[PDB]
């Protein structure tokens, strides 16, 4: 049996158990992925590799993650591009910026990607996003075109609490975002 676990309730200035890529850094107890600045990417990884399944037995791990995040836009109308929790190869490095969220490079299935991500997408990119134009939560596997999406109303500047859970017995990945009022 293998378990990996950690919790960070307030990030410190030198958070040595995280690997920072792009613009990610910690300021005033928060992990900052981007400032409200144009065309940037910020990524942050837990430093330990996690054993998520085994080729010998064919077993898959169960896991849960919860976090509180804040998106703070200049106003409720001009907001982009969003945010992602992802599971990638140990040597994952930033991919395309913009609507690709620093994690994919295409709209087409890319088997070399090997990453699955739950996106909180704030900008409607006409080429791949659900046509109704709403902001949404999406599950993405090897492509920026989510395999399933739910419309979400952004509350600018408010704390949102999310729980992501994977149940290995059913292969159900569940995502829950609550705004506390």
């Amino acid at each position: 049996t293998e378990t990996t676990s950690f919790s960070i309730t307030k990030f410190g200035p030198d958070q040595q158990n995280l690997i920072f890529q792009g613009d990610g850094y910690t300021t005033k107890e928060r992990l900052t992925l981007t400032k409200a600045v144009r065309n940037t990417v910020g990524r942050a990884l837990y430093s330990s590799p996690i054993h998520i399944w085994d080729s010998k037995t064919g077993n898959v791990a169960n896991f849960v993650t919860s976090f509180t995040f804040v998106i703070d836009a200049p106003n409720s109308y001009n907001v982009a591009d969003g945010f992602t929790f992802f599971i990638a190869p140990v040597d994952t490095k930033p991919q395309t910026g913009g609507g690709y969220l620093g994690v994919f490079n295409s709209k087409d299935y890319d088997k070399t990607s090997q990453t699955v991500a739950v996106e909180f997408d704030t900008f409607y990119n006409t080429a791949w996003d659900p046509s109704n134009g709403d902001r949404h939560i999406g599950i993405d596997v090897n492509s920026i075109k989510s395999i399933n999406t739910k419309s979400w109303a952004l509350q600018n500047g408010k704390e949102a609490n999310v729980v992501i859970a994977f149940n290995a017995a059913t292969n159900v990945l569940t995502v829950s975002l609550t705004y506390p009022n």
Partner: protein, 51 residues
């Protein structure tokens, strides 16, 4: 309390390596916004297996 939910069957062992790194990503393009995370908890549990 207003909640949003999504569940999907995704057979992870068809997509990711056995060993992975997890993390967050956030981008801006022509439009922008600050993306911050205030706290983070994680726990994984693999029945039996390194092999």
């Amino acid at each position: 309390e207003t909640s949003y939910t999504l569940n999907e069957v995704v057979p992870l062992k068809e997509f990711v390596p056995e060993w992975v790194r997890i993390g967050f990503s956030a981008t801006t393009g022509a439009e922008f916004a600050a993306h911050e995370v205030l706290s983070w908890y994680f726990h994984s549990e693999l029945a039996g297996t390194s092999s």
